[PDB]
Every structure is written in structure tokens, then in C-alpha cells.
């Protein structure tokens, strides 16, 4: 997260860290046994880490659980990044408490101007590399589709939305992928892609979760 602030230990209870010997993606806990993340975060040997703040130190409240199965959307296109969503089933149910809790799926899509909270342990520098120990947060509004399509001509699908600041300085970045975009207590987006990080006129692009609620529910129901 570039230009964000330190969230505060366990203030974003649904935030998870995908780990394969190092943190590589974020995710959102949607129930005691399922996590939502980005399809491009897929890899074998994923360990889901819940209740984290400092990802380099065991401070208490953490729950390390192996992924029993990762379900990349059948129609995910690695070239266009369309349908960039993945469901991860935990080997065992997480113990839900104040520090570890699930986030609600939306019943409707969010409109332009809606203010959201984006979080992650990704790079904090637009020009260079600096990964934080603790979870970072950023409040950002959902942009109008016209501005989004003007910024990325021919690259925005109906399953994507832009969120951020056109003036630059604040944005998600490498290492934030798969993380949550929560607006009004509902999971509206998943960190996906962007041209650079926090660049002028190049806002972050996110997977539009409201388009996948039926798929998520039907898939969880049969697995």
C-alpha cells in the first residue's frame, strides 16, 4: 500500500496473508473455512495466515492453516485478467473471534464515489521497494467507469472497477493482490492490477466481487 497508514493490530480481522515461505498475496476470510483472493495469486503449497499484524513476528492471535484446495475461476484469463478471482478452502475451520472474523459478501454493487478501505502488506514505495512488517490501510473511493476506461482504454472489463486517486500518491501495489476492498462492511473488490503504483492518472484496478456472488455461493455449496 503506497501512501497509506498503519491499520493497528487486528483492526481488519478478515484480512489474511497467503504464505509460501514468505508473504505473497492477501485475501479475505468470508466464512470459517473459505477465503477469497485473486486468481493470479494461485500456486501450490499455500499456507493461509489469519490474525496477523506483524508478518515477521509471532505475536499471538495468529492461526496458520493449510489450504486444502484452491479454486481459480474456470474462466480466468491470464492475458486480460478478466475473472481474476479464486476461492481457497481451509484444511480446518478457523476459530472466529474478535481478532479473526469474516467479511460479508455484497448484495448489490457499489456506485462511484463510495468510500472503501483497502489493506495489505505490499510495497509502500512507488519508485523502489519497501515491504512493511505490519498491515497497512488506505481509504479510497470507487471511480466512475468513464474515468476508469479513460485511464485504461480497452483494458477494463465489466468485471473490473477502478478505485483510488488520479492525482497519484495513494494506491495498492505489489504484494497487495488478492486483498480486500471493503465498502460499508461489504467485500466489493479484490486487489488485482495497475500500471505501476500510485502513478498520476493510473488508478488501481480491482475485481468486481458483486458480479461473482452467485458463483461464490454455488461453488462453496458444492465443495
Amino acid at each position: 500500500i503506497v501512501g497509506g497508514y498503519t491499520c493497528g493490530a487486528n483492526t481488519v480481522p478478515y484480512q489474511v496473508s497467503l504464505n509460501s515461505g514468505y508473504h505473497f498475496c492477501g485475501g479475505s476470510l468470508i466464512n470459517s473455512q473459505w477465503v477469497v483472493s485473486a486468481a493470479h495469486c494461485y500456486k501450490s503449497g499455500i499456507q493461509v495466515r489469519l490474525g496477523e499484524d506483524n508478518i515477521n513476528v509471532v505475536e499471538g492471535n495468529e492461526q496458520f492453516i493449510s489450504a486444502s484446495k484452491s479454486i481459480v475461476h474456470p474462466s480466468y484469463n491470464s492475458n486480460t485478467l478478466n475473472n481474476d478471482i479464486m476461492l481457497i478452502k481451509l484444511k480446518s475451520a478457523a476459530s472466529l473471534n474478535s481478532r479473526v472474523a469474516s467479511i460479508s459478501l455484497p448484495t448489490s454493487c457499489a456506485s462511484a464515489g463510495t468510500q472503501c478501505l483497502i489493506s495489505g502488506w505490499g510495497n509502500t514505495k512507488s519508485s523502489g521497494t519497501s515491504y512493511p512488517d505490519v498491515l497497512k490501510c488506505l481509504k479510497a473511493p470507487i471511480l466512475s467507469d468513464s474515468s476508469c476506461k479513460s485511464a485504461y482504454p480497452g483494458q477494463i472489463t465489466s468485471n473490473m472497477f477502478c478505485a483510488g486517486y488520479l492525482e497519484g500518491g495513494k494506491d495498492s501495489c505489489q504484494g497487495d493482490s488478492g486483498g480486500p476492498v471493503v465498502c460499508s462492511g461489504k467485500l466489493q473488490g479484490i486487489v488485482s492490477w495497475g500500471s505501476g503504483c500510485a502513478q498520476k492518472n493510473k488508478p488501481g484496478v480491482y475485481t468486481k466481487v458483486c458480479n461473482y456472488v452467485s458463483w461464490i455461493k454455488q461453488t462453496i455449496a458444492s465443495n
Binding site: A38, H40, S172, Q174, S177, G194, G204
Partner: peptide
């Protein structure tokens, strides 16, 4: 591009 490491 994608905001993982580094796709």
C-alpha cells in the same frame, strides 16, 4: 501489471 510477486 498484476500486484503479486511479481505477476
Amino acid at each position: 501489471x498484476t500486484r503479486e510477486l511479481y505477476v
